Amino acid sequence: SVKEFLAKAKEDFLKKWENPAQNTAHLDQFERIKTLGTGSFGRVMLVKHMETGNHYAMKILDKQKVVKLKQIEHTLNEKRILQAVNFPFLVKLEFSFKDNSNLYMVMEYVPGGEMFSHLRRIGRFSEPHARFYAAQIVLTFEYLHSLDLIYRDLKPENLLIDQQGYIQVTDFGFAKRVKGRTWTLCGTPEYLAPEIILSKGYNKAVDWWALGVLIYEMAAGYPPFFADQPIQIYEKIVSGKVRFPSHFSSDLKDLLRNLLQVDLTKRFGNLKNGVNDIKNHKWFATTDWIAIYQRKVEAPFIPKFKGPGDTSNFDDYEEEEIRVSINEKCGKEFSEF
Amino acid sequence: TTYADFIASGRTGRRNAIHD
Numbered sequence: 001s002v003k004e005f006l007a008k009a010k011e012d013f014l015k016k017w018e019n020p021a022q023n024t025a026h027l028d029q030f031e032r033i034k035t036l037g038t039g040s041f042g043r044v045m046l047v048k049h050m051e052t053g054n055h056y057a058m059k060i061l062d063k064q065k066v067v068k069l070k071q072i073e074h075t076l077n078e079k080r081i082l083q084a085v086n087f088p089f090l091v092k093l094e095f096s097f098k099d100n101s102n103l104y105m106v107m108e109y110v111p112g113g114e115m116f117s118h119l120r121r122i123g124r125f126s127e128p129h130a131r132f133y134a135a136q137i138v139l140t141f142e143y144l145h146s147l148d149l150i151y152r153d154l155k156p157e158n159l160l161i162d163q164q165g166y167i168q169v170t171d172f173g174f175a176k177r178v179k180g181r182t183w184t185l186c187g188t189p190e191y192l193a194p195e196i197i198l199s200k201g202y203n204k205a206v207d208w209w210a211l212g213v214l215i216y217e218m219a220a221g222y223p224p225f226f227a228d229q230p231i232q233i234y235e236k237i238v239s240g241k242v243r244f245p246s247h248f249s250s251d252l253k254d255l256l257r258n259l260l261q262v263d264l265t266k267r268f269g270n271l272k273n274g275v276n277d278i279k280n281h282k283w284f285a286t287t288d289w290i291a292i293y294q295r296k297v298e299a300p301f302i303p304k305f306k307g308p309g310d311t312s313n314f315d316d317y318e319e320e321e322i323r324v325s326i327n328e329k330c331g332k333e334f335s336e337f
Numbered sequence: 338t339t340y341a342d343f344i345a346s347g348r349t350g351r352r353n354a355i356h357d
């Protein structure tokens with residue numbers, strides 16, 4: 001039973017939520033290999049852990065840059081939530097620590113690369129291919145939302161493909177435990193629900209809208225609302241007129257009309273019948289939800305595996321030193337990390 | 338075509354998150 005599965009999942013999460021793990025490794029325990037990505041207050045590096053010889057993705061955040069960008073509480077949220085959760089399609093936080101200058105989250109490394117990369121290269125996914133990935137997100141949000149968590153940055157750039165061709169969700173920087181409404185303007189322009197743009201309080205329904213955007217983008221090869229500047233993207237979302245490619249199946253268009261629904265009383269995922277409106281839709285008629293969770297379903301695409309440590313499915317970035325000041329920065333702000 | 342317009346746009350690369 002989904003209900004009883006989720007109930008026990010909540011008991012597991014709550015214990016870790018209320019007593020967060022802290023300071024479970026040190027920088028000098030890892031060899032730094034290669035930068036795999038960069039953001040505004042941080043980067044992600046491939047590292048090797050000397051004691052096990054395991055490869056990980058180590059997220060390094062500059063505390064001073066976090067403070068400037070007003071992301072203190074969001075960073076505390078990210079680490080606190082990630083050490084507490086456990087789901088087959090969420091990338092696992094293995095260790096966390098901090099030093100004078102930086103915060104570190106060490107995650108399982110996913111060498112297959114980002115969905116973004118494969119999607120842009122291949123162009124678009126067929127409906128069964130898209131449906132297989134969407135299913136995993138539907139179950140992931142069902143899990144997260146049951147824990148009162150909103151994810152708030154669904155996009156292909158945050159979805160990695162593992163060695164079995166299943167999805168791993170990355171980047172919890174905007175994830176938040178909230179019962180009721182919240183107000184932060186955050187996300188990525190193409191993926192923002194109209195509520196967010198119009199500066200209303202919003203809730204987990206913004207994740208289900210984001211799923212509509214992702215499904216459209218996977219099946220079409222471009223998002224439903226695009227332009228050269230974000231302001232132009234926002235104008236399009238709030239009008240919310242969507243046009244579907246002629247190749248979209250009838251069922252797909254009807255699912256997307258219900259996900260990309262400006263009206264919250266009518267948006268799927270939000271309604272009295274919850275996720276089941278989504279799960280029991282015709283577009284998902286062929287989906288065996290248990291087998292997906294169990295990873296028994298055969299994946300449409302398996303990444304080229306060139307070994308442990310391989311970074312060929314990732315782009316190249318400029319390397320930059322990991323500087324650690326001799327003085328502690330921002331000690332009070334990040335005390336609980 | 339819509340594909341052509343997307344590919345000619347400045348938002349075919351990795352998209353940055355926003356916040357206030």
Ligand SMILES: Cc1n[nH]c2ccc(-c3cncc(OC[C@@H](N)Cc4c[nH]c5ccccc45)c3)cc12
Pocket residue numbers: 036037038039040041042043044057059060091107108109110111157158160170171172173354
């Ligand atoms: C490559 C890889 N293997 N396992 C993981 C886990 C987590 C990440 C990851 C974690 N946090 C953020 C990530 O960002 C992808 C984009 N959203 C770009 C981005 C936005 N903010 C930051 C901060 C630091 C680095 C990258 C980014 C990926 C990557 C990997």
